[PDB]
Symmetry: C2
Subunit: 546 residues, 2 copies
């Protein structure tokens, strides 16, 4: 029974193989066949390329030794190299062309999910070229998906020396017959096969995956597309900023580039952005995913007026000041979406761009109190239930597992009647005590929210709903303004509270507004349709925010 799978980087996990670019260079420049491959291997174990792969010299030190090898090879072949011949140019473009072989990476991820330990065993070099960041970026995306990354230049050994295969087995803690080894170079499979390992010679990807399916007994080809990479809380960088005495904000941070601030809704967490955080960082952004005030590890003062929009927005500005950020892109969902529109309206100089998921921008009506507008629409009756301090807290904190299992559901799995909540005497009065698990979340994901709400409870989060009059008075000061910075509104077809039709007149206030729309998507947008959300945000960020 196989339990480990080892992959080579060049020619297996990343295509095209740098070695294959030497063949293409020979044809393009009309050089004798194999000339560049002979210069590359010149000297064997005592040669310059072996010294490079063992980490004795760097790539920049090797480049002139390879040029010397090219001339000595062309001298015996009785040929002349062109005047513009450059090993640096050839290798720079070969490394640049190399991209992740997505089907191979997906097969490795599927095997890891099914219990396999996975590793990359590669012959590679210490890259000190001015363009080395491109390679560093490639290695970073790859290494996060594998249990082990063994590089020849770090261990002083190279394939096909039998010592590196022994080192591999010691690292994996497995016997040879428990390992599948994939490589595009035949000479590299020979020692693995002598040990008794299963070997797959990789010529084309599809045939290699067909062989891999047959030995593992696991379907890898023709399977559904997987969900985006989700992040593990214990692997994140956690940040804490004190914005004022007794008010500290917690956030998770990933990536480099323009700052993007993610603002969750009710009753959520920074964890509600788990599928967006790796995708946005990989697209070239520095992601800051907040625990909003009243939630998780951020401070939760009991006073109602600590959660009015004017105070929340001032603290978010202080948060940027203390981090040394002149601007950030603000992306919000639900209550966070409301906050991001007010950030654009009152502090436009600090907001690079603004996006809201589900929450529309609706201007304040100076002739009508918001408490009267809410009574007219029966779907917002639960907001009246949330007004009296202590009432909704007691119900929502009684059983945390029940609370999160009943709320976090897809649109076709609804278990909560959101009508006559006040008359019924509660949110969960005609609801099951043990609801089934939604297809959207796992038990482990529910337990993360349960643990976060054991710390401060629902008082802080519910206080966001208890400043209707204060928010309305403050918003009335902005009625003469327009939002003229880059903006995105994303509607969710099946959000039965924040309906797409509530956003129809936004163009009157944000004349250059961009739109996104997600079909078959309910209220919990980020975890309901993560791939669709990622694609919409990344496209908009790349065109209007960078």
């Amino acid at each position: 029974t196989l339990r480990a799978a080892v992959f080579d980087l060049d020619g297996v996990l990343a295509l095209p193989a740098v070695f294959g670019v030497l063949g293409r260079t020979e044809e393009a420049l009309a050089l004798p066949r194999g000339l560049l491959n002979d210069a590359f291997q010149k000297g064997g174990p005592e040669g310059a390329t072996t010294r490079l792969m063992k980490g004795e010299i760097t790539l920049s030190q090797w480049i002139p030794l390879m040029e010397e090898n090219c001339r000595k090879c062309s001298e015996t072949a009785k040929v002349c190299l062109p005047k513009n011949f450059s090993i640096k140019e050839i290798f720079d473009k070969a490394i640049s062309a190399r991209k992740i072989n997505r089907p191979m990476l997906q097969a490795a991820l599927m095997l890891r999910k099914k219990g396999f330990t996975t590793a990359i065993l590669t012959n590679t070099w210490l890259d000190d070229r001015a363009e080395r960041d491109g390679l560093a970026q490639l290695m970073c995306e790859l290494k996060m998906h594998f249990d082990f990354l063994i590089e020849s230049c770090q261990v002083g050994m190279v394939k096909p020396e039998p010592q590196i295969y022994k080192f591999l087995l010691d690292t994996l803690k497995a016997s040879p017959s428990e390992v599948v080894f994939l490589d595009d170079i035949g000479a590299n499979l020979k020692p693995a096969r002598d040990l008794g390992m299963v070997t797959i010679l990789v010529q084309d990807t599809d045939t290699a995956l067909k062989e891999l399916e047959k030995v593992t007994g696991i379907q890898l080809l023709n399977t559904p597309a997987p969900l985006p990479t989700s992040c593990n809380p214990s692997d994140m960088s956690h940040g804490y900023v004190t914005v004022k005495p007794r008010v500290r904000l917690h956030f998770v941070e990933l990536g480099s580039g323009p700052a993007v601030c993610l603002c969750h809704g009710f009753p959520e967490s920074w964890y509600s952005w788990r599928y967006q955080i790796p995708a946005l960082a990989q697209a070239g952004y520095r992601v800051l995913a907040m625990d909003m005030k009243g939630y998780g590890e951020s401070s939760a003062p009991p006073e109602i007026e600590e959660y009015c929009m004017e105070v929340l927005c001032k603290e978010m500005v202080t948060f940027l000041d203390k981090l040394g950020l002149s601007q950030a892109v603000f992306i919000g969902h639900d209550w966070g979406g409301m906050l991001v529109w007010y950030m654009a309206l009152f502090y436009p100089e600090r907001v690079r761009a603004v996006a809201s998921l589900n929450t529309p921008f609706i201007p304040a009506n100076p002739n009508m109190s918001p408490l009267e507008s809410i009574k007219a629409n029966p779907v917002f009756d639960y907001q009246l239930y949330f007004q009296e301090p202590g009432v909704a807290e007691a119900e929502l904190e009684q059983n945390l597992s029940r609370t999160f299992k009943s709320l976090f559901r897809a649109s076709d799995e609804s278990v909560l009647s959101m009508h006559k909540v006040c008359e019924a005497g509660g949110l969960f009065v005609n609801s099951p005590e043990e609801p089934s698990l939604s297809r959207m979340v796992t038990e482990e994901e529910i337990q993360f929210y349960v643990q976060q709400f054991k710390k401060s409870g629902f008082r802080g989060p519910l206080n966001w709903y208890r400043n209707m009059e204060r928010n309305w008075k403050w918003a009335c000061k902005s009625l003469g303004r327009k939002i003229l910075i880059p903006a995105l509104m994303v509607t969710a077809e099946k959000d039965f509270v924040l309906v797409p039709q509530m956003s129809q007149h936004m163009e009157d206030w944000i004349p250059h507004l961009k739109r996104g729309h997600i079909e078959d998507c309910g209220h919990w947008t980020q975890m309901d349709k993560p791939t669709e959300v990622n694609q919409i945000l990344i496209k908009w960020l790349d065109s209007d925010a960078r």
Copy 2:
């Protein structure tokens, strides 16, 4: 007795005044005198500019109303505006030209140091132009130096309405005769003077500062240049990353832009970079100042081999992986400087650029154990004293205040004989029990280090010295490599341990090395000559790392 000073932004803290650029535009375009100033003030309290300053409309909404005002003014003056006339272009360049009036800012900082509460009271607008980041950046540098920032567009009031002066006094908690008010516009001083405040009309900076000196009785003009801005620990964003089980690294983070990682020496803290962190962030860098392993809030395992260079460097790579950083500029001092040279040698793809303060790169000698090389030089005798576990710990932890007061001294204030430390039986055997305070540090700064070392003690920090053989064996693997990425070596004239002469052959290994040299500077480079360090690092970062 005065106890508060209020400054205007435009024409006082930032020059040239945006209002004065209208006068220059009229002369350049040969328009009638005062034409642009009349259009700007057109309508008075009911006018477009008053609505802008009150926050009713944004700058982009105001621009076409000002253009309309310009045409109506030119119609009554019987003149024609040129075809290329643009209010946007005029205002864009006026805002761009405005820079901090350094002598005025220095006078405000001196008053704040002497006990005064300081504030900015300004007539300003909500800037939503595509170029608004330049203004946001200006406001961020300024606001950190003042107790209060009162902006007209945020409070709905404008100078010279008497309501804003009443609001100012309520905010300051002071009576009118305790306030000095500086403004370049005469009409704005009138209400402050009616209340009984001291007013200074600002035409030229030097005369305004002479008047300010006379009323406060404090010297502001002709004083020595102040030290760089230092940061307050409670105002920083603190980050925590788990690099492996039981090993968590703490860092402080400030700024946006290319990542710069600061690595302290022994026995120090992230706090040793207090004068560099605000300067590097202001220059356009995202600064990450570490608590190295064994120190402050980072994990401190007791095992010696947890502090060998191979393990420390691997953890720093994992730190970049978990933060989502493909590369960082590495800047080290003392033991941190040694680590940064090994990062460049073993992980060049992750290092954008490398700088060391005091610590030279000295290649390993494969023919001689490092323990024998140390015995030949009598100045490194204290490193032999540090070898036996428990001995130096007991002496250094006995009195923490004495330990840091004896070490952190300028070169002319030395109280420690670094010769025959082993024979003497200790580092502080012929040293005072209560040493005087060095001119380099304050009692408050010493107490920060005292508190940090009360948590884990000296075991972790001293373990960095107890892996000589392990480090030497690992370094021998790099003897065939050269450092070919951008590099800076900064020598300190009066470091009597890490002497400038120890770095003389570095060019053999780092052929493109850049150099810096600080005269009259001892071992504690960052806090001994902070302005000189800042200037050298910023110039190098701007040319070779960005």
